[PDB]
């Protein structure tokens, strides 16, 4: 009896342990696309600046 409960207790312990592991390990789909969003925004900062400088270059060319 006692050990049967202990078995169950450790079984669910290991279940939780695998779950909490994956909570930090997984890095879910949403995490990727969210970071891409951020990434993209900074790219668009460059888009704006670089295009402006490309225009500027042309203006300086003549």
């Amino acid at each position: 009896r006692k050990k049967e409960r202990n078995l169950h207790l450790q079984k669910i312990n290991s279940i939780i342990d695998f779950i909490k592991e994956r909570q930090s390990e997984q890095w879910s789909r949403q995490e990727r696309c969210f970071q891409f969003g951020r990434l993209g925004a900074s790219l668009h900062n460059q888009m704006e600046k670089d295009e402006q400088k490309r225009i500027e270059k042309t203006a300086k060319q003549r």
């Binding site: 789909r29 696309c33 993209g40 888009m47």
Partner: protein
């Protein structure tokens, strides 16, 4: 890494496919290759099959791997793809004796994925990329994802994809694609043609088709200032037409809005839903027709805008006339708006943005392939580690 000229972006579609091997380095340009999505199949003794670019001896069958955006014969599809890849290999090899000393060396592959493909479909495709075409750099982007970059990156937005026999409805929240809400309508540009044929049953189908393509065809809300106008046929004939040139679009549009409403009504976080409604993106060849996008917006607007119902608003005003604070509602949308285009791509500005989804892919492509990490794509290593399953490690 990576050579601009070696980055291959392929965009499949129910009709043709866009291929653009190599980037323009300085700027972005419109894909120059366009190949009909068809391949021939020869039935040999006991059903053995071959594939052909043409109809060998008039015995091969016409196969169309993609139907309504969905792969219906993956064997044929990968054969089609194979043909394309080797076509451009031989093209450049003939054009450049030293092609394998440079541009045909390390070739990045970006394939645009239509959402309807199954999990198993995708696996098989990646299998052929690495085990048939032996390509050591694979990205299979969600088509909708690509679109969200093109519109100066949006967090909450909608993608309306107008096809020829189908239209896809996609909602993006927090940059993620809500797959359980994503759907599709069995209607597209062809339905316009169908209704135009119904409208003018005495016309040749080609007259109708070429008219659809023609600048005289328009969705309304200076050829609009004339009762009649003309258009030159494929055969050089002068086609004269009345206001029928502004007809045949509402059926499509109405059905689009039906699903748009139903789909967006299922977004859980209403705060985000409100944001989604202010960023609507419209893509597809048919959407190039002038006024189309505006009409679609308008239809969506009049059928979903939360605003004190006409007369009731006037009753507030009526009683005032004898200032009324804004009659706020707990519902949404209160603002319906189309997303803003980037003004930093002259080439695309000039071409129009009906194919802008490719641009979005191009933009993110240089973002990915000039980056020091390989975080978002399958390498030969990763492929060796997981097999086809590697795709869900990098899944977007």
């Amino acid at each position: 890494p990576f050579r601009q000229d070696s980055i291959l972006i392929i965009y499949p579609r129910s009709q043709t496919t866009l291929v653009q091997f190599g980037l323009n380095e300085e700027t972005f340009t419109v894909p120059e290759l366009e190949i009909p999505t068809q391949i021939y199949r020869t039935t040999r003794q006991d059903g053995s099959y071959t594939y052909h670019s043409t109809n060998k001896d008039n015995k091969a069958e016409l196969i169309k791997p993609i139907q309504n955006g969905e792969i219906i014969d993956i064997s044929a599809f990968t054969q089609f793809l194979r043909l394309i890849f080797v076509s451009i290999l031989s093209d450049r090899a003939n054009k450049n004796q030293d092609a394998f000393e440079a541009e045909l060396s390390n070739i990045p592959l970006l394939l645009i994925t239509h959402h309807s493909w199954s999990q198993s479909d995708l696996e098989i495709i990646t299998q052929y990329v690495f085990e048939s075409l032996e390509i050591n750099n694979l990205i299979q982007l969600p088509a909708s994802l690509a679109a969200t970059y093109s519109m100066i990156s949006l967090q909450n937005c909608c993608i309306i994809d107008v096809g020829t026999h189908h239209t896809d409805i996609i909602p993006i929240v927090d940059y993620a694609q809500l797959d359980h809400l994503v759907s599709s309508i069995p209607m597209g540009g062809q339905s316009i043609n169908d209704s135009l044929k119904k409208l003018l049953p005495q016309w040749d189908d080609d007259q109708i088709e070429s008219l659809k393509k023609s600048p005289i065809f328009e969705v309304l809300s200076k050829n609009s200032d004339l009762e009649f106008n003309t258009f030159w046929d494929e055969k050089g004939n002068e086609i004269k037409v009345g206001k029928q040139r502004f007809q045949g679009c509402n059926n499509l549009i109405k059905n689009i809005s039906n699903r748009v409403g139903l789909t967006l009504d299922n977004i859980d976080d209403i705060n985000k839903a409100k944001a989604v409604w202010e960023n609507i993106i419209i893509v597809g060849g048919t959407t190039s027709i002038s006024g189309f996008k505006e009409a679609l917006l308008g239809q969506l607007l009049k059928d979903h805008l939360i605003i004190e119902p006409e007369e009731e608003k006037s009753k507030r005003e009526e009683e005032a006339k004898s200032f009324v604070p804004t009659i706020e509602y707990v519902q949404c949308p209160t603002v319906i708006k189309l997303a803003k285009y980037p003004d930093y791509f002259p080439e695309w500005k000039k071409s129009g943005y009906s194919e802008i989804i490719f641009l979005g892919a191009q933009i993110v492509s240089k973002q990915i392939f000039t980056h020091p990490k390989d975080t978002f794509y399958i390498t030969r290593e990763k492929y060796n580690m997981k097999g086809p399953a590697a795709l869900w490690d990098v899944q977007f």
